[PDB]
Design a binder for this molecule. Structure first.
Ligand SMILES: [Mg+2]
Lengths: 411, 452
RNA sequence: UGAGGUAGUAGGUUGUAUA
DNA sequence: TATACAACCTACTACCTC
């Protein structure tokens, strides 16, 4: 009550899977080498009902199909049935006059033009010759597809740890100050271009400091410290009810993140990195002369793209809702000589998209981590001198994630 | 260390009541759900366009193989897959002479050249539609190489005026080997992906001809799904902001309904990506009546999602028009918030389906990533996650995330594994793009065949 | 426009606090 | 009506295709 299909192993495979699953769907027990040597010879003799042979240029000379054909011919000469072998023509470069012996005298089915017509005529032939069947069970042709072809392609209960780019802030300055500094700061002076992070926010009581000593820029040194207001950076966050009529607790955090994003920008001006301008942010990259062999800790941060040189650059931005973090984003900045930037803005897009195609998870991870570690002064932190005595500290090690479902990596 | 939960991938229902995950793999084994007897085609292009189209339509009648049949499954052939007959002999042809094209594209203008070409093609199509006996289901506009170098949206809107399905096919797509250019290499070689092009074209043609490729099965009965997208019609006089919607509710039993909810409701302001009370009331009433006409009952929950926040001025109107015990939930789906998760060991990215729950109202869904079945990445470099927030209403975050994956699994325009955002938003954006270029269309059709 | 994705370049609105 | 700043919103172009 079986059906035997013979085919080449490396070629003429997809047709065999399609045909086998289609015939299983309608209720025809098929015995193919894909689904699962003496067993083959026993199934051709004592079990099979119709022996189908696939004809192709790749086939027609393979040893295994020829041996199976010979056994099938011997069984046919005993079973007294002239329709035991039904060739299927699934090629278009092999003539009908080049078919090997023992099958050359049998009319084929010509799956060449279209597979649906071949399947329809095959089913009509089976119905005409009274091949046994069971009611269509379309579930089984899905079950075997999942079991055999999708065995190794699933989700395993495997544990991995994921890195991130959210570098957290270990410690904050203790006090946020609200200095008055009336008539000692001209109404025309920009609060920017000043050595320390400051902004004129809130109804006077301006020049948000985090530290004193804006001297040699605004020489008045005639301030009564009593009028200055001081808040706690612990209640300014965590909704510690720092919300007052002076400033509510929502504006205060939006006010601190500004100081963080200014402190980063003014700290990077003191390192060995230069700057690049983007649409809405700044990017920092290392020159060619710095760093030995262009590699910091065995990770390369500058190389060559034909006549150009490529540099790795990062940006940053504060955030305070989940935890105080510093979101770092990666960039590639292209130059010409290695120290002189390219003033195109039209070829740098076409070079970024060219270079980023060979870079995957590993390269991005190592270059980002190496660039972050290059800036750090302390072993486990990087120093933002917001003040002459206080500072903001960001961790060298980004936040880590972990999961419980995963996959087996390809070889 | 923070733990990421996993959302099991949804399953789509093919013919015979069987489930699968990859449409390319489920259509071959089982096939589409409905029976359309055949697709009678129609071509509007040059005679060489007709030759190219007939050559391609004869080529796709037999199996086509990709380079990698695990990442990109092979194509059995149109009749083997869909059980239909889309032949290269029952083809209605309406010719466009090269003289007309040269006359209409020689110098003219830009907005005049595009308008003239659209008038020519639409005149041919509409004339063939109204005064002729032969029936054409899908019209295939074979666009020469010199025409595509704005036209597509105009064509689709001015045909939307008469509700005629259409499909634009440039000659470079179907004859990529001939258009060599460069120094001897094709501008876009399809040699390794020739089994994906056939899949996508065939599924688009089948859907646009009244066919139903697949359907969703794992979604909550009763609840609706509206997706609002705002487009800037401000390019013309009287700057405004048009809003478009799309509904995905389930039939009274064993069915899926996926249409549009249009009639775009404008906003006179400049940066106000929001809606007025009356327009919000009209939109909700129209959607609710659309659901009730089919299911003969009112919904149990309305699931509104968009790319923007919902203010308290529209939600009050929404609650004012909602009857009985129909709850409402507002969800906002941002796309490019900067959080990238790497893998500590390996050169392959994070698996798709991982969700990082920040708060009970926020989460980080991962739609792009590494698919074990395809053994490849759905994106390039390190994938970016979408951000899901339950803005207004009360609901569980995990149910919302499951629904987002379910919506992601419903792209009919292309035959792929999945997308990176719910398909309702994308189709609403397509509808808005089509309607912006039009000129005051009243009561547009609600079917995606005319737009997509 | 067979499709999907990744980036860059431009703008705009709100919310304070100033003019 | 205008300078500076965080937080969101859109709309184009241009290059890759695993
Ligand atoms: Mg389309």
């Amino acid at each position: 009550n079986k059906i035997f299909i013979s085919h080449a192993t490396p070629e003429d495979d997809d047709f065999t899977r399609w045909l086998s699953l289609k015939l299983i769907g309608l209720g025809y027990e098929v015995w193919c080498d894909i689904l699962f040597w003496s067993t083959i010879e026993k199934e051709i003799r004592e079990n099979t009902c119709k022996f189908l042979i696939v004809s192709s240029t790749a086939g027609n000379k393979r040893e295994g199909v020829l041996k199976e054909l010979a056994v099938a011919t011997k069984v046919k000469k005993h079973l007294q049935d002239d329709m035991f072998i039904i060739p299927l023509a699934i090629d278009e470069n092999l003539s009908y006059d080049d078919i090997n012996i023992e099958i050359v005298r049998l009319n084929a089915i010509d799956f060449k033009k279209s597979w649906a017509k071949g399947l329809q005529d095959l089913l009509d032939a089976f119905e005409k010759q009274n091949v046994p069947k069971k009611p269509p069970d379309h579930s089984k042709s899905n079950l075997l597809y999942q079991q055999i072809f999708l065995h190794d392609k699933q989700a395993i209960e495997k544990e991995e740890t994921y890195d991130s780019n959210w570098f957290p802030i270990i410690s904050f300055p203790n006090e946020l100050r609200f200095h008055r500094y009336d008539w000692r700061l001209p109404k025309q002076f920009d609060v920017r271009t000043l050595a320390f992070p400051a902004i004129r926010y809130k109804e006077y009581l301006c020049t948000f400091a985090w530290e004193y000593d804006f001297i040699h820029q605004l020489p008045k040194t005639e301030t009564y410290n009593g009028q200055e207001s001081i808040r706690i950076s612990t209640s300014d966050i965590l909704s510690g009810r720092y919300d007052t009529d002076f400033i509510r607790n929502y504006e205060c955090q939006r006010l601190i993140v500004q100081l963080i994003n200014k402190a980063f920008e003014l700290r990077m001006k003191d390192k060995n990195v230069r700057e690049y301008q983007m649409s809405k942010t700044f990017a920092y990259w290392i020159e060619k002369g710095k760093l030995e062999k262009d590699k910091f800790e065995k990770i390369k941060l500058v190389g060559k793209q034909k006549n150009k040189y490529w540099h790795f650059g990062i940006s940053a931005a504060g955030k305070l809702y989940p935890s105080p973090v510093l979101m770092v984003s990666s960039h590639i900045i292209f130059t010409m000589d290695g120290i002189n930037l390219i003033k195109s803005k039209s070829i740098q897009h076409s070079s970024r998209r060219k270079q980023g195609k060979n870079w995957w998870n590993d390269k991005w991870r190592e270059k980002l981590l190496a660039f972050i570690r290059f800036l750090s002064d302390d072993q486990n932190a990087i120093y933002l001198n917001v003040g002459s005595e206080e500072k903001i500290l960001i961790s060298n090690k980004p936040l880590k994630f972990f999961g419980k479902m995963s996959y087996v990596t390809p070889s | 260390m923070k733990e990421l939960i996993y959302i099991e991938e949804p399953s789509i229902l093919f013919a015979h009541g069987q489930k699968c995950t990859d449409p390319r793999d489920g259509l071959a084994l089982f096939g589409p759900l409905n029976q359309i007897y055949g697709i009678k085609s129609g071509v509007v292009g040059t005679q060489k366009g007709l030759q190219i189209f007939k050559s391609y339509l004869d080529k796709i009648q037999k199996p086509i193989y990709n380079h990698n049949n695990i990442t990109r499954p092979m194509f059995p052939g149109f009749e083997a897959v869909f059980g239909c007959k889309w032949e290269s002999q029952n083809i209605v042809f309406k010719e466009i002479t090269d003289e007309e094209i040269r006359r209409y594209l020689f110098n003219a203008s830009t907005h005049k050249r595009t308008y003239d070409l659209v008038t020519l093609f639409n005149d041919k199509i509409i004339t063939a539609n109204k005064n002729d006996e032969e029936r054409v289901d899908v019209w295939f506009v074979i666009v020469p190489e010199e025409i595509y170098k704005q036209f597509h949206d105009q064509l689709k809107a001015r045909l939307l005026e008469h509700t005629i399905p259409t499909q634009i096919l440039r000659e470079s797509t179907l004859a990529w080997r001939d258009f060599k250019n460069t120094f001897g290499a094709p501008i876009r070689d399809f040699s390794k992906i020739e089994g994906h092009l056939a899949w996508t074209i065939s599924t688009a043609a089948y859907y646009k001809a009244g066919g139903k490729p697949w359907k969703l099965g794992d979604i909550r009965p009763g609840v609706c799904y509206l997706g609002l997208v705002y487009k800037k019609i401000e390019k013309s006089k009287n700057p405004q902001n048009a809003c478009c919607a799309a509904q995905m509710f389930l039939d009274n039993g064993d069915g899926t309904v996926f249409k549009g909810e249009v009639g775009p409701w404008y906003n006179p302001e400049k940066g106000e990506y929001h809606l007025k009370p009356k327009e919000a009331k009209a939109l909700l009433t129209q959607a609710l009546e659309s659901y009730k006409e089919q299911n003969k009952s009112y919904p149990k929950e309305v699931f509104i999602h968009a790319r923007t926040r919902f203010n308290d001025e529209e939600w009050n109107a929404f609650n004012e028009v909602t009857p009985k015990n129909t709850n409402l939930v507002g969800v906002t789906i941002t796309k490019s918030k900067p959080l990238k998760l790497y893998k500590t060991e390996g050169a392959f990215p994070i698996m798709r389906g991982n969700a990082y729950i920040v708060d009970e109202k926020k989460a980080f869904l991962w739609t792009l990533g590494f698919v074990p079945k395809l053994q490849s990445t759905l994106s390039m470099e390190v994938p970016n996650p979408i951000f899901i927030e339950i803005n207004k209403g009360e609901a569980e975050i995990q149910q919302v995330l499951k629904d987002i994956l379910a919506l992601t699994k419903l792209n009919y325009n292309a035959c792929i594994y999945a997308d990176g955002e719910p398909v309702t938003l994308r189709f609403a954006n397509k509808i808005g793009e089509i309607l912006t270029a039009s000129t005051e269309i009243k009561t547009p059709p609600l079917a995606f065949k005319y737009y997509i």
